[PDB]
Amino acid sequence: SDKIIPIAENKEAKAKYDILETYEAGIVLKGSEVKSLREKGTVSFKDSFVRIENGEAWLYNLYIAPYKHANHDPLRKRKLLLHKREIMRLYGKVQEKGYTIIPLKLYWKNNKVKVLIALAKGKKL
RNA sequence: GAUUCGACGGGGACUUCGGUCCUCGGACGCGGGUUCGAUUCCCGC
Incomplete structure (x- = not known):
């Protein structure tokens, strides 16, 4: 039913x-990026975070390794496709409780790239 | 093998206007075009 x-x-x-x-998820990716995501290409979530700007949702510091396609800043503010009520929801929480929104994973789901997003707290340790 | 569930942009529908939707574009090097329909066909970079 849902191969991923x-x-x-x-x-x-x-x-x-x-x-x-x-x-x-839901991420408007640039062509090249998809190819170099299939071609295997390296990717890291180091110091990556998500921000809600003009009513939108943005993934801020995701390194997507480029490829021989001839330009494509590996970091790009990438936009997330996520449902207004979902943004508004997330947004609220961030204020109200000071929480934070971070990326948990990247994956394919019907040859569509997607990123899992969570609304998290800190651990205190 | 419709299809980013969604954001955004372009069209459009119903509404006590607060709502509720449809559809088209976009991510498979970059711009097109063929076709109902094309990451896989065609035409330059």
């Missing part, structure tokens, strides 16, 4: 944030 293939998970985040809610 892992691309990259964020280990540096499973022992740091305590997940409160998870939401599913």
